[PDB]
Symmetry: D2
Subunit: 359 residues, 4 copies
């Protein structure tokens, strides 16, 4: 069977025929892969930045059900949930390994579990998300969008601590979000916050790209060039109710944006920072106490979040059609090894999502 494989912690990636008998199976439903997605997580493991001699790569997949099984019909499109439980803790027991207490969960194509960059795999209906045929083209985004659905859900849950966090009209339309970083993660946070009605400012240390400019205009989102810091933003628009680090940049980015967090606000740490040490002085911390501010680490979406992502992706085909069409940057055939290895190894500037087509 053709599979894209890695050998962690070593760097490297290969597309090669492997013995199906040694690959991980998870249930009774045979699924033939049609699309994989690639993200920075894949790039990390390929570059060695993170029994069996290898691991099947990939945690973003859409496949077709080969034979009808219980609720699933032949020809149905499905997406597997990538993080799976430890089987010990109560959070995993209720289907929520995003809050696993042991840290002994598996992550497909990353840790403990063969991923989905292979011709076909067997899975359990428990871990399969139904992808409507009507979103086959952009449906691969339901996996990354799921992490973002969970994050926004959690931020909203946490803000229930505030007696009234709604606005004069009972909505959240008056709440302002600063999304720091404009890769696929930043763009998806922006799309989803705007879907919920909150005001959004995207920030990056440059002018917008073509894709970003389309998102700006279509979603009625604001943009700030942060190249020379945030003073000018603070002075013009004031402070923000929510700030999202969609970075993975130097952690000093936090020192820059923390002064822009407003009373009762939330700083959501979603990016995985890769460098730096950020100093927080007593004046900054004292002020966080006085104003009921919160900092939250945000990670991993689960099945309900995948299902919510599907609904939102569907909505965006109507609401934000130009942005929706730009979510897929390009598609590489599994049979185009030179190009395939290229895109597995490194991101292109302004890339949103690269899809792998199985054919």
């Amino acid at each position: 069977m053709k599979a894209i494989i890695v050998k962690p912690p070593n760097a490297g990636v290969q597309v090669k025929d492997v013995d199906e008998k040694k690959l991980d199976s998870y249930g009774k439903i045979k699924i033939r892969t049609i699309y994989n997605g690639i993200c920075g997580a894949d790039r990390e493991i390929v570059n060695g930045k993170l029994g069996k001699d290898f691991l099947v790569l990939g945690h973003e997949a859409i496949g077709v059900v080969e034979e009808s099984y219980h609720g699933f019909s032949q020809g149905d499109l499905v997406m597997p949930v990538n993080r799976r439980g430890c089987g010990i803790c109560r959070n995993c027991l209720v289907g929520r390994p995003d809050f696993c207490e042991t840290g002994e969960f598996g992550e497909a194509g990353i840790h403990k579990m063969d991923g989905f960059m292979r011709e076909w795999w067997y899975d359990d209906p428990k871990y399969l998300v139904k992808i409507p045929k009507s979103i086959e083209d952009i449906g691969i985004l339901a996996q990354p969008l799921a992490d973002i659905e969970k994050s926004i859900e959690e931020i909203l849950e946490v803000q229930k601590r505030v007696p009234v966090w709604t606005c004069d009209d009972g909505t959240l339309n008056c709440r302002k979000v600063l999304v720091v970083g404009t890769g696929p993660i930043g763009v998806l946070f922006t799309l989803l916050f705007r879907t919920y009605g909150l005001e959004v400012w995207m920030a990056n240390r440059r002018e917008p790209t073509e894709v970003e400019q389309t998102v700006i205009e279509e979603t009625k989102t604001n943009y700030y060039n942060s190249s020379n810091g945030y003073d000018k933003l603070k002075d013009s628009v004031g402070k923000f109710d929510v700030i999202i680090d969609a970075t993975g940049a130097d952690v000093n980015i936090l020192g820059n944006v923390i002064p822009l967090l407003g009373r009762n606000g939330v700083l959501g740490l979603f990016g995985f920072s890769t460098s730096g040490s950020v100093p927080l002085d007593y004046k900054t911390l004292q002020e966080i106490v006085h104003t009921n501010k919160t900092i939250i680490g945000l990670v991993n979406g689960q099945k309900p979040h995948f299902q919510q992502a599907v609904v939102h992706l569907a909505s965006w085909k109507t609401l934000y059609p130009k942005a929706a069409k730009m979510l897929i940057t390009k598609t590489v055939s599994i049979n185009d090894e030179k190009e395939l290895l290229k895109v597995l190894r490194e991101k292109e500037h302004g890339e949103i999502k690269i899809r792998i087509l199985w054919e």
Copy 2:
């Protein structure tokens, strides 16, 4: 009228006769002061660290209702809520200026509002908490305890974000709290978390005082001498579900305890740190993201929290009688000006609460 007065931002304090006609009144009910309490906030304003020529000091008070008015009867003991709303924002409009969005609230004895260190004042029933005569002796603690009630309420609300944060028995008994600092605040956090059944470790850079040892033994609380850091605690007991900074220590304390925070955990920032700059490196912040950790600034209790505090103080007379008896360190007469000035200007080592008696 005798009053304790300060003149911010300048240091200094005076006990003198002032013109009653110029003092702030808040409603129709005349209250004669019997007790005030003193805390670090009073010491700070007296020491110049934080229409009218002066401000009446003091935000912790019990008084007696001089004449019956609606629900309040002559002879009833009452305590005023100290932070009052800005009259503009939706949080203040629902009786919750602890979450004021404008920052234009008042704080008795600190900001905008004359406090309660004066022979009598007029207040509105809406801002008065009924103090049962059976807790007259320790009832003064309801004001500081209210901040702690609000804080624990808030932590427990935030933790609803975790699908299952309860234990195998449906309780929080398995959850571990590290209370850093053992002043009145640390002691009250410890008493209240033990009341709720969570396991508690108190930490300070020394061995326990006699009062702290009584609390330890009576409440079945653990203690850790953190003089040489937290490695030995971490190795023996592991990580904590909740960590409270009750310090008002250099912010580098956060650097010492953040590595002891467990998965899905909460760092509650309650103390107002007064020096230092703490570095947070990328490894620390990335781990916060991976594990759904949260940092929350905790401030100010409101009326429901004062009422809850009354119930808990009442409970502690039965549950923790020895600790309850040690909550009041000494009482100083309003007429003993030398001793009064002494205790207004500086804390005594091991002090929990000084009461001022009006007579």
Copy 3:
């Protein structure tokens, strides 16, 4: 100005020119009506079955066009007004939520205290206007009825936070089953929305499905039960339900028939306004409700956040359920077509979902 007017408590309805000076104004933004919707509440007032003025402007479902570029509203923007407005006194109205008004002194456009939106134009306050994307102009009128249902489902889900674990083995609510009693617009919208959220749905009515219902059933993978001879057969085959919605408007004895199908920890959601009958609840039934943590909840009125959520869902359905989405608007009647307009104002046709009025 042309308006559709009624004179409660009397029956009757007229389309006539009325004095603009007489009609209620709510703010500074001039909005020109393009569409109205008609619902049962409108029918009831027209049939006479539901101070300072000789008449009331009918209608609480509307989409209008913004006449001038105001604050956050551009000329040509489509907007829908929120129909219930607060009492100005109570804490729930002061936070934008008169659905929970404590005084009962709220107003309801085209029903109670406030002129409706079946008129050429009206003035409104931006706070009460919901933006309707041009991309859903055709089905956007459904945002008003769907809002009541968004609120209702939101509330059911909030209430069920009482249950330590109401989610399923996979962390979803996919295993939860809903019985929606009654079809037509409300039942259909409840079914669409519950299916969007992933719960299993059975629709029930005392007959076989209409073509539109059949389309909804098949496209959304919903189940249907012919309840003509009661619910014994459903209970014996499928068992009990986690949520039951009364979308009836009929006799309250329907509740006697479906309460035996409510499962442990379940919610009976009362949304329809029952119009006849008395239902007896015996001690055995009530005791069992106590033993199983069951809840019965009165469900009423959506507010601005719910209107906004409805817009997103309606947009989603164009992709998820395109066949059903098209069938939501049964027909459009011109404001100028008087005989047809009076017909549709006075009576529902069998199988009707939504009739829209077009202002030309």
Copy 4:
């Protein structure tokens, strides 16, 4: 081993010596019984209205016989009475009050031997620590737990209301009608007043001495409902919460439903024993229009037992007179005539009878 035994569904009760080998064990901790409580459920089984036999009783305080992990010799403990089915997700998180299978056990009622026996073995997970400082009234933590859960659930449900708090951020302005003034009604009243809500107790007679004490000490109101509720409605108006604590004919609900206020909650806690109540379309439509809710309230679990302990401790200070009245009397296990009598029938105005093991 001495034990109080019943043979459901048949009527009857005996105190006899029974083969210890036959009795149910639940864990490794040996607990020697000191007190039991008796309630209506006990009387029902005794009267045949609800192994060859079942050990009666689900209200117990026992003493830990040896020092175990977390439990010192001489410690007082109370067992949680309802235990899970081991299958469903609610049971698996320690909350069989919400069991989805109905295959839970209840000590001294079904599936599980009770605690009216000399001693039993239990699992530490099911034991609630009872402070020595509340030994005297501690037996009430079991019935109070059902009520702690009930109020918790009402407050959870009312989060659906955007603002259910008052002008001062409290619930002091919220009014509760507690219908029925038995041990349950009294405990509801005490707990709601502890939380600061206004309470009206109602019964179809004037108050007993004990009820009058609770009324006066807690500043609770009382309404004689002998001739219906119109007078109360005319004077006080409507209520935010109504608790049925009667166990009487369901037509009580028809009388009190018209007194429920906008956004209000009718809490069904009592187990009604007769009747049928008609609900007309006018009443039901009005419930829809005003966001009203009716909720079935049942069973407290471990966190609720622990909360009950704290509140009982608080009442020794807050409401000392009422607290001293919660225990009506104590009967020795060795006084068989009086013991059989109290197992078989409630005395008028009784709150709680305790059985002492000597």
